[PDB]
Amino acid sequence: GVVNVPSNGREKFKKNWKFCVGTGRLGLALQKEYLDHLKLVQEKIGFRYIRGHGLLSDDVGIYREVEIDGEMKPFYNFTYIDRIVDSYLALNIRPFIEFGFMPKALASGDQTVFYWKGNVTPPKDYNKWRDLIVAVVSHFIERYGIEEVRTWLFEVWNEPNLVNFWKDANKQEYFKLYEVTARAVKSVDPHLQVGGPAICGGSDEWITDFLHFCAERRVPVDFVSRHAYTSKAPHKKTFEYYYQELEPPEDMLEQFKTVRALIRQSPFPHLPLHITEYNTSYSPINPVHDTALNAAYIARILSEGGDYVDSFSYWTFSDVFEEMDVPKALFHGGFGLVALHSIPKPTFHAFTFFNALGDELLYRDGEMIVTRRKDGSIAAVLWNLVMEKGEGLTKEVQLVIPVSESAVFIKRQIVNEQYGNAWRVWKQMGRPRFPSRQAVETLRQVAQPHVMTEQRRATDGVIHLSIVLSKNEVTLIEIEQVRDETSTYVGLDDGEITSYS
Amino acid sequence: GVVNVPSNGREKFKKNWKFCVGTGRLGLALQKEYLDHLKLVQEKIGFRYIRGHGLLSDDVGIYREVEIDGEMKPFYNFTYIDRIVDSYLALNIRPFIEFGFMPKALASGDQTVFYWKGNVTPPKDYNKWRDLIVAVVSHFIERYGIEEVRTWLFEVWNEPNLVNFWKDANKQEYFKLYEVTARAVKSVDPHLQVGGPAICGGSDEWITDFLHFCAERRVPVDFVSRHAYTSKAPHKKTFEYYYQELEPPEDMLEQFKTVRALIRQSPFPHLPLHITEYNTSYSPINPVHDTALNAAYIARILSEGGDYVDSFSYWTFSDVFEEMDVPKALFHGGFGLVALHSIPKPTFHAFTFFNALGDELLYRDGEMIVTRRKDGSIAAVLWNLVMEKGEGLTKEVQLVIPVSESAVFIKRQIVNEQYGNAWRVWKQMGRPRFPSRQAVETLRQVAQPHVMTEQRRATDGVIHLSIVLSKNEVTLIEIEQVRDETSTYVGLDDGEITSYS
Amino acid sequence: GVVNVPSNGREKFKKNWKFCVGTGRLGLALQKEYLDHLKLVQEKIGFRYIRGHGLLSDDVGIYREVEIDGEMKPFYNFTYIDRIVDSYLALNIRPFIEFGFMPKALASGDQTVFYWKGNVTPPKDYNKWRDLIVAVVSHFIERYGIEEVRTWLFEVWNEPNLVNFWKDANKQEYFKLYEVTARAVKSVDPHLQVGGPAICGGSDEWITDFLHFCAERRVPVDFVSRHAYTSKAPHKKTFEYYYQELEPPEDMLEQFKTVRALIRQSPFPHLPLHITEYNTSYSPINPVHDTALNAAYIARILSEGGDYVDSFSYWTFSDVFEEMDVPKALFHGGFGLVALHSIPKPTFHAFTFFNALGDELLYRDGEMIVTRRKDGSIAAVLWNLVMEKGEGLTKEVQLVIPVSESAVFIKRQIVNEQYGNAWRVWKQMGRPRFPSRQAVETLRQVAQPHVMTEQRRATDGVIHLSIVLSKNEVTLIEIEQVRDETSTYVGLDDGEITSYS
Amino acid sequence: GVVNVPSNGREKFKKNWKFCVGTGRLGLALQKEYLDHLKLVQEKIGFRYIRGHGLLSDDVGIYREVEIDGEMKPFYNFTYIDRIVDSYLALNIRPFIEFGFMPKALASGDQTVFYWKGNVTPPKDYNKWRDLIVAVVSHFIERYGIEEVRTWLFEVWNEPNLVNFWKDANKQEYFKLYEVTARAVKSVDPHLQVGGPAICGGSDEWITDFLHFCAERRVPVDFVSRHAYTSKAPHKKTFEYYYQELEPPEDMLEQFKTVRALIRQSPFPHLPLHITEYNTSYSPINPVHDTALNAAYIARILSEGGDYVDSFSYWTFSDVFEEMDVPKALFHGGFGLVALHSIPKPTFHAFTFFNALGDELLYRDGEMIVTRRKDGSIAAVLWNLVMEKGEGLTKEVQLVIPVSESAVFIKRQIVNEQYGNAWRVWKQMGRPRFPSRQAVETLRQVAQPHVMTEQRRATDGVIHLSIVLSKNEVTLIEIEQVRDETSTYVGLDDGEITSYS
Ligand SMILES: [Ca+2]
Ligand SMILES: [Ca+2]
Ligand SMILES: [Ca+2]
């Protein structure tokens, strides 16, 4: 198809796409490997906030008791989160705090979730929980100052509409939990932004009921959160993998758009919507995450997601993750943009490529976005999602582009099934679970995008680009003005160099 | 032609090719840019020695006088070589010291060489020159230890057979300068290895006569040094460039082979031969240095030069160079393997590819070298040197390589006119002289070798590679055992992932 | 009194004292904090080996069971020890491997030890344990090379004579565990050094019985391991401390001596003796560890312990530890040489000071060690251990040292109750449990030794040092050659500078 | 002297004292050593601007001709200043540009200044000099953008009232050069701040005459610049030293104040005054720079200089400097805050101490400055400048400070003749010209300030500090609130640790 790019544009592409990114549990942030991947992510994409589970779980170790004279008394150990949040602020990223799970010494029952056994029961004593929240938020303000902590966000719990994350999926108990948390947070400082309900899909009446619980009972709410995946239940499991079919990306966009409509009808029509988890599959052992398809699929969501929501947070930035035990191989289906040994997966490159876009929107359809940057240069990202099996399945794109600058330097970066894909080459190596240093460096070189460059002289103030994208390709194309300095090199003749003309 | 690679090899490919590398003047080693380049060269190519001019020239500033009690007395200022030689040893490289040029306060005349004005006249007092040599050598021993300094090499002066480097190209004055320096060095310690005569090509009788001089007067000598280039004097000039025609690589190898024979017919038949400079062109402003042709040309030399000499030192590791003034553009025909902003030029990847070869030499002709490493893997560099003008001129090559290892992972890296080639992309950018940071990063990215990988199974203990090499391509092919772990992934099926089979 | 230092010494002070250092459990090696601590320790102290628990425990996560073709089969996950052992080797340290504790899926019972719950029961199947040992040692050889792995050591289990560490303190069942482990290690490669019984003090008949067991059933043993502490059982507890009284250092040296003699009477008289754990207190929450007293105590051990044993491993290099939960304040009584935030405790300086000592032992008594270095310089460590309460309690020492110089430069470094002691300043700060960054930097600053320097000219070939050591001071004195260059500064007069003479 | 420090102050202590710092010539900024020093200075004292000579001198290399056809034509080589200014900005410092000296290819005559021979003659053609300024200023805008370059400052020449720096000290010829330069800069962009006349002391009529010339003839001026020193001509020289008597600090402040009054009476009454160089001695080989006296002298200036001027630029940040050849010894009387090897001099610590001061001024006299900061802590810098000879000469200072905070933590840092003084210890080592790495590390350690800390309890709402300062001491005293956490450590008893009470 032939697309004619207009010279200027009315609308502005937002940075909503990189507002937030997900993570494995906060206690894993103590790992050097974790910080390795986070530094890479902050250099090449730079997210504003980071969101995961386990702030209050026992590895991070904040809530204890502590026998004094003859009675159990609370003790708040900030050793670990002080280091964790410090390490975050040093990398220019703030916590999108999630309060959870339940500390053991505060839990009412035995039910846990994950390999790491986060306790998912309500607190035995709601006043002890309140006091925990006040202690934690108060500490954060003591350490980092009120101005800093006022920029953070505070979600209460996680997926209370699923039985695995909250006892009996108890709607009313969660609302009580929400109100105690919300009010405890405001009691420390009224500007702090608290929100919920952090639910998985399939049950959006919870968002209607949540916002009505808060209206009726005058309970604070500053944002709404929901999670969004497109995978069905596993159709085949091995001992290490879940395999799942996926709905197309418009299904996710519809989810975003549907939840925003439910907010617009509610008694709090102005509330921000934060999609605090999203990916194709919701399982950390689904190999789909390691593929070019995942990138081409996510590219579509990056292009449009921000039209409906204030943020959507890719779960996750890193394979440093233990919800289903320690990764059993290098490419093991983890959620991360970044694989162990800081090896970028195809999806990472899609973010990177979006990070080259300018604020000015020239054109956008279901397979491309075209922008103008301040300097006058064009930056476009194009993608060829093909969810069906088969080879070939190429897509041609004909881009007529307005530009006054008489010559143009075009730099294209590509990742697809052949290039920027460490997963493909890892198969060639024999799928080493625990590869050598040298196999890993080779995987790191191969994981880099394939670059091609050209110079093109304009005809009639317009350039034509013929772009062939192969199956599940995502590509960045930057088009810059050539200020040719050749004529300053007086006498220059390449033909005077052996072999050249 | 079909190349049958034997499974075993008797001969051993020596590491002579990276004994020593060349540099711009030692005062330039104080620059941060210099040290960035050397760090990159030492990580990707481990050179043992580094050889350049200007140890005794005035920017380094060792030789001074100094009015004390009505008398002009020597002062030896080691502030700068201390720092320089320290930085060398920290990067695991030792100085192939070159004694020169003439300190101004000790010069007999006015004649200089280069924009930096190295003085090229005899010492006004030969006893003060000797005292200089003794104080410097002694200083090295006091600072670093006798054992360390004893592993160094000491070449005396530079190209005395050229009027530009030595007043009148005075043979007997040079032999005298050599003699005073050689005895000065030995008087500090008899195991310090001293040599000469450091001549350019064109007059090899100087080697014959030099050794007859040392024989008659029993002047200590421990190696013969010589420089070797294949460029004719320039046939065109701009304010910016010297352009030169080149003879083929066989011309240089014959120069090596000629000088070795001359040492064998002499009264010191066993002397080591160090070619302390080599490249295609001897001009630091000949663009040929920046091209893929240079890379293929030199790969020929890296493959065989060690057959005839103990070392051959590429002039130079880096464009940090001022013989013909500060560089006037990013790619300005400088000698270096690395360009400003630490951008590898194509020749750098030739050195890097040779660094991947094993000790065991399995096969070699005029266009390839195939080797076996200690772990049984195969490693070959192939080049397609085309000096003639024109397009295409591709060379197909057929390989029959034995490996009992029944499946194989092949990693190929290529640098040619299209890949690994910053120069090409600089030109497409309009030859920016002083590029932006953004342009430099793109040129760095494009400067990386293109990588192709495949898996292949052996039929009958053997693999057959059909390889295509474009114009002036150099390429590294590594062939590793696949230890396939796929069977341990029970129930793995890529066809259960969206879009894959 | 007065000490006449002899100019020459017969004896050598051995490097035994820094052969090995202890660590918190291996899974903690994944922390950034841990690795910052190791780097500091490896730069300032030369440790060769690193010994700790948890290798086979479930955080590191090697042993898993996995359902394949309808049976429970072993899966060995090397993801984490690959990264751990990689990071050890990159910092020039190798594992003193300790095979333990019991993986949960292989345990025969439910008894655990520590906050992190390592299982302390026998394996439910000894053949599976064996296959576990074999798979781990084989994986090491595969990744690191057989020559690398042969330099390691392999301890079997931990304190099997203590009921907390091993079911019933079952002697005969530990011997069985040793045999199955030792024969499995030898089956992989016969050079691999294996030993035990890794007992705590109080029941040294276990060494005699362990060696008689290995003699009678021809079981491979390459060393005897043993733990040494001087602390009585805690006489007071708070919710975060154990306080304990200590025996003097001679008690530890006698423990070393008495165990060595037991080896020499047994059927393996020549076997190496590795004290794989030692410190004053055996509790990771006894504040004595954070004090100048600890450093004074342990310096006496460093000075003599090598006389009796091949190695004695200070438990531990770092407060990065979790046996009794996450540290509840900055200085919490941890074992570490280094405190969180890379703050060196006084004991760390004791090790640093011993790292400056020379080979040649000139003199030693129970309060000093005086040595000569290869360059002729003198290095001495002195300590004033004072276990009794009160102020003052100084030791005046007089040293008559010979030197072959004529003028000398004396650099003294000191750590005591006032200087190089962050615990004291932490107290002055109000004992902040979770100090700010600003406070931490102040604590690091103040943690640095105090330095005093002087020049002193000899008389009659000799130097008379008067030295005052304060309560529990450890101090380094280096006496070096002055090569006065003042005479080359002709006309120099500090009296011409404003205010000076 | 008993000082009662008020609770609140009406005035602000300005940041003018670290607005700018001086440097050796801009070409030396290419040195790794230089950037090591700049980084350190920028980490501990964050200066905003850096001011030095030689931008247009031929080592940096900007101006060349360049034979084309048969005519000499201008070529502007931006290779080196691009690297220099990039490195400045990456370290958060901007150029206070000084246009000079004269490029040889533009020079009218052959007179030069310094070891490095900057040419101090007018341009042969003022149109060529204009075309140079336009090319340089324009290139700066092209690379860094117009907003950034407008924050810089542009001074014309150096000390044109001194015959050494400018042919004949020709007043009218400098005004002509100012006019051509100023108009040139303004023709690129009118908001660029240009000024002069950069004079040395002893003839302040030049400032009057400059400003009248600019008013009458409507030449752009945006600031006045002037240099200030207090050293008399040398009374003794050696081959390597100038020794000079110093006027007291009142003389410098009186210089500042005098020039400010001349501007206030001029036709441009409101012009900023920048003192573009200042120190005690004006000679780069006067040992006084290396001393504690220099530090105590400069502190009075840092305390008050900002009263009269908009900036005052300490000449220099670093001993990396070649005006009078390469440093002949480690401490050689160089201008730098930082000695070679990154060793801080006593004067460096003065600046670091001032960098801890708060904005709100509580109390100031001629020997101390006392401030409050945002968090409520008190920071004070005290100094005891003694310019006469003699030992002892201690100053007792009694501070009576208000705090209701219950108790306080006092951190004191001292640099004087005994502590923080590497010069003193370098002499003890026998004044090594070219010390070993090991002697250098010792001088670094010894160069760190001496720290003392204490907790003091508030009696009656007031803390009474008694501070004995030794001769030529400068010292920082921070007083913070103790939030005591001791009572949360229930049961804590240091008396339960061996030896402690
Ligand atoms: Ca040079
Ligand atoms: Ca532990
Ligand atoms: Ca200079």
Q: Identify the helix (H) or strand (E) that includes residue B415.
A: strand B407-415
Interface of B with A in 272-301 (CB under 8 A): 280, 286-288, 291, 293
Name residue C240's beta-bridge partners: none
Question: Contact, D180 vs D130, CB < 8 A?
Answer: yes
Give yes or no: residues C402 and C339 share one domain: no
3-state secondary structure of C240: coil
CA distance C366 to C303: 8
Cβ pairs A/B, distance under 8 A: 152
Q: DSSP states of D371-397 as a string? A: EE-TTS-EEEEEE----S--S---EEE
Question: Do A417 and A23 form a contact (C-beta atoms < 8 A)?
Answer: no
Residues C68 and C214 in one domain: yes
Catalytic entry in D98, D155, D179, D277: D277
Residues of chain D contacting residue B31, judged by C-beta atoms under 8 Å apart? 30-32
Q: Which two tokens stand for residue C55?
A: 């290798």
**Chains near A, with 3+ CB pairs < 8 A?**
B, C, D
Based on the fold, state whether residues A3 and A24 are members of the same structural domain.
no
- D308 with D253: CB under 8 angstroms? yes
Burial D242-271 (b: 16+ CB within 10 A, else e): bbbbbeebeebbebbeebbebbeebebeeb
Q: Looking at the structure, do residues C386 and C275 belong to the same domain, yes or no?
A: no
What are the tokens at B398? 């057929």
Ligand 1 centroid–CA C483 distance in Å is 36
Q: Are C3 and C26 within one domain?
A: no
Kindly compute the dihedral angle of the four CA atoms of residues D321, D324, D325, D328, in this order, to the nearest 10 degrees.
Answer: -90
- Mind telling me how many Å the CA of B286 is from chain A's nearest CA? 8
- For B472, which of A387, A496, A499 is closest by C-beta distance? A499
Contacting residues of C for D430, CB less than 8 Å apart: 407, 409, 455, 482-486
Q: Which residue among the candidates A98, A155, A179, A277 is catalytic per the annotation?
A: A277
Q: Which of B98, B155, B179, B277 is catalytic?
A: B277
User: Does the residue B139 lie in any domain?
Assistant: yes
- Assess whether C415 and C351 both reside in one domain: no
Among B328, B358, B388, the domain-final residue is B358
Measured CA to CA, the distance from residue C244 to residue C283 in angstroms comes to 9
Q: What is the layout of strands, in order, in the sheet containing D378-383?
A: D360-365, D368-372, D378-383, D474-481, D407-415, D450-457
| Structural contact between residues A272 and A222, judged by C-beta atoms closer than 8 angstroms | yes
d(CA B84, CA C206): 60
User: What distance in Å separates the CA atoms of residue D434 and residue A407, rounded to the nearest whole number?
Assistant: 57
CA of B23 to the centre of ligand 1 (A): 8
Q: Which residues pair with A265 in a beta bridge?
A: none
Residues B319 and B347 in one domain: yes
Number of domains in chain D: 2
Contact B412, B455 (CB under 8 A): no
d(CA C71, CA D20): 75
User: What's the order of all strands across the beta sheet hosting B395-402?
Assistant: B2-4, B395-402, B462-469
In a domain, B498, yes or no: no
Closest CA to D411 of D455, D443, D373: D455
Q: Is D434 on the interface with B (CB under 8 A)?
A: yes
- Determine, for residues D33 and B33 on separate chains, whether the beta-carbon distance falls below 8 Å: no
> Any bridge partners for residue B412, and if so which?
B452, B477
What six digits make up the tokens of C138? 């084989």
Intra-chain end-to-end CA distance of chain D, in Å? 38
Q: Is residue C72 part of a domain?
A: yes
D277 catalytic? Reply is yes
Q: What number of H helices and E strands is found in chain D?
A: 11, 27
CB D117 within 8 A of CB D129: no
User: What DSSP element (H or E) covers B196?
Assistant: strand B193-199
How far, in Å, are B379, B411, B414, B444, B451 from residue B475 at the CA level? 11, 10, 4, 19, 10
**Cβ–Cβ under 8 Å, residues D456 and D408:** yes
Cα B54 to averaged position of ligand 1 atoms, centre (Å): 8
CATH number of the domain within which B457 lies = 2.60.40.1500
Which value, in Å, is the radius of gyration of the alpha carbons in chain C?
A: 25
Residue A50 one-letter amino acid: I
Nearest chain D residue to B31 by CA: give it: D31
CB of D115 less than 8 A from some CB of B: no
Q: How far apart are CA D419 and CA D440, in angstroms?
A: 16
Cis status of the peptide bond prior to C316, with omega within 30 of 0: yes
Structure tokens at D12: 């602000």
DSSP state of D85: H
Question: Which is nearest to C223 in space by CA: C209, C207, C206?
Answer: C207
The whole-angstrom distance between residue A315's C-alpha and the CA centroid of its chain comes to 5
B171-188 vs B126-144: helix axis angle to the nearest 10?
Answer: 40
CA distances from A409 to B290, B424, C209, D494 (A): 21, 12, 81, 72
CATH of the domain at C135: 3.20.20.80
Q: How far is CA A364 from CA A9, A18, A295, A383, A462, in A?
A: 11, 18, 18, 12, 19
β strands within D137-290, DSSP E: 153-156, 193-199, 223-228, 236-237, 242-243, 273-278
The structure tokens listed for D403 are 């705090």
**Beta-carbon separation of B245 and A498 below 8 A:** yes
* Residue D100 alpha carbon to ligand 3 centre in Å: 13
Mark which of C338, C358, C378 sits at the end of a domain.
C358
Residue B68 forms contact with C (CB below 8 Å):
yes
Length of chain D: 501
DSSP SS3 for C146: helix
Helix, strand and coil percent figures for chain B, each rounded to 5 = 35, 25, 40
In this structure, the answer to whether residues A112 and A207 fall within a common structural domain is yes
| Partner-chain residue, chosen from C77, C325, C433, that has the shortest CB–CB distance to A326 | C77
Q: Minimal Cα–Cα distance from B174 to chain D, Å? A: 30
Same domain, A377 and A348: no
Q: Which domain, by its residues, includes B387?
A: 1-13+359-481
Q: Is A374 an interface residue toward D (CB < 8 Å)?
A: no
For ligand 3, the distance from its centroid to the CA atom of residue D25, given in whole angstroms, is 4
Length of chain A as a residue count: 501
Asked if residue C495 belongs to a domain, the reply is no
User: Buried b / exposed e across A435-459, counting CB within 10 Å, b at 16+?
Assistant: beeebbebbebbbbbbbbbeeeebe
Indicate the DSSP class of residue B478: E
Quote the DSSP letter at residue C52: -
Beta-bridged to residue B312, according to DSSP, are B275
The residue from C317, C340, C358 where one domain ends is C358
Q: What are phi and psi of D139, to 5 degrees?
A: -65, -45
Cβ contacts (< 8 Å) between C33 and chain A: which residues? 30, 83
C236, C265: one domain: yes
Structure tokens at D20: 């700018």
Whether C159 sits among the annotated catalytic residues: the reply is yes
Region for A175 from its dihedrals, namely left if φ exceeds 0, alpha if ψ lies in -120 to 50, beta otherwise: alpha
Residues with CB under 5 A from ligand 1 (ion): B 24-25, 321-323
CB contact under 8 A, C491 and D241: yes
> For residue B24, how far is its CA from the centre of ligand 1 (angstroms)?
4
| Neighboring chain D residues of B86 at a CB cutoff of 8 Å | 437
A493 assigned to some structural domain? no
Determine the Cα–Cα distance for residues B414 and B469; give it in Å rounded to an integer. Answer: 9
Which technique was used to obtain these atomic coordinates? Answer: X-ray
Task: Indicate the pairing of strand C2-4 with strand A193-199.
Answer: unpaired
In a domain, D406, yes or no: yes
Q: Do D325 and B61 touch (CB under 8 A)?
A: yes
Contacting subunits of C (3+ beta carbon pairs below 8 A):
A, B, D
How many whole angstroms separate alpha carbon B439 and alpha carbon B180?
A: 52
Region of B135 please: left (phi>0), alpha (psi -120 to 50) or beta.
alpha
**Of residues D66, D87, D328, nearest to B77 (C-beta):** D328
Can you name the residues that pair with B51 across neighbouring β-strands?
B22
Three-class DSSP category at B407: strand
Name the catalytic one among B98, B159, B179, B480.
B159
**Does D5 lie in the same domain as D56?**
no
Contacts B240 to A, Cβ<8 Å: 489-492
Q: What angle do CA A409, B40, A453 make, to 5 degrees?
A: 15
Residue C2, chain B, CB below 8 Å: the answer is: no
Contacts of C226 (CB under 8 A, 6+ apart): C197, C198, C199, C201, C207, C259, C273, C274, C275, C276
Q: What is the Cα–Cα distance from D39 to A101, expressed in whole angstroms?
A: 44
- Cα distance from N-terminal residue to C-terminal residue, chain A: 37
Q: Mind telling me how many Å the CA of B58 is from chain D's nearest CA? A: 10
Please give the Cα distance from C260 to C255 (Å, whole number). 9
C474: nearest Cα among C390, C354, C373:
C354
- d(CA A281, CA A297) in angstroms, rounded, equals 11
Determine phi and psi for D477, rounding to 5 degrees.
-130, 110
Instruction: Assess A105–C contact: CB distance below 8 Å, yes or no.
Output: no
Answer whether C498 sits within 8 Å of D238, measured CB to CB: no
Whether C197 contacts chain A with CB within 8 A: no
C498 within domain boundaries: no
Cα–Cα dist D392/D470, whole Å: 7
Q: Could you tell me if D108 and D232 lie in one domain?
A: yes
Considering only CA atoms, which of B347, B337, B260 is closest in space to residue B300?
B347
Phi, psi of C157 (to 5 degrees): 75, -170
Question: Is B486 part of a structural domain of the chain?
Answer: no
Ligand closest to the CA atom of residue D53: 3
3 state DSSP class of B263: helix
> CA A114, A115, A117, A118 torsion: positive or negative?
negative
State whether residue A393 sits within 8 Å of chain B by CB.
no
The answer to whether D177 touches D157, Cβ cutoff 8 Å, is yes
Subunits next to D (3 or more Cβ pairs <8 Å) are A, B, C
B490 touches chain C (CB under 8 A): yes
Backbone dihedral angles phi then psi of residue C215, each to the nearest 5 degrees: -70, -45
Q: Which residues of B touch A386 (CB under 8 A)?
A: 499
Q: CA-CA distance, A232 to A234, in Å (whole number)?
A: 6
Which ranges constitute the DSSP H helices of C242-362? 249-265, 292-304, 346-354
What residue spans of D243-382 are helical by DSSP H? 249-265, 292-304, 346-354
The reply to whether omega before D268 is within 30° of 0 (cis) is no
Q: Quote the Cα angle for B394-B399-B400, to 5°.
A: 165
Q: What are the chain A neighbours of B486 within 8 Å (beta carbons)?
A: 430-431
DSSP D415-441: ESSSSS-HHHHHHHTT--SS--HHHHH
Tally of CA atoms within 13 A in the half-sphere of D68 that contains its CB: 13
CB contact under 8 A, D493 and C388: no
Residue D398 in contact with residue D382, Cβ under 8 Å?
no
Structure's resolution in angstroms? 2.2
Residues in A closer than 8 angstroms to C325, CB to CB, are 61, 64, 77
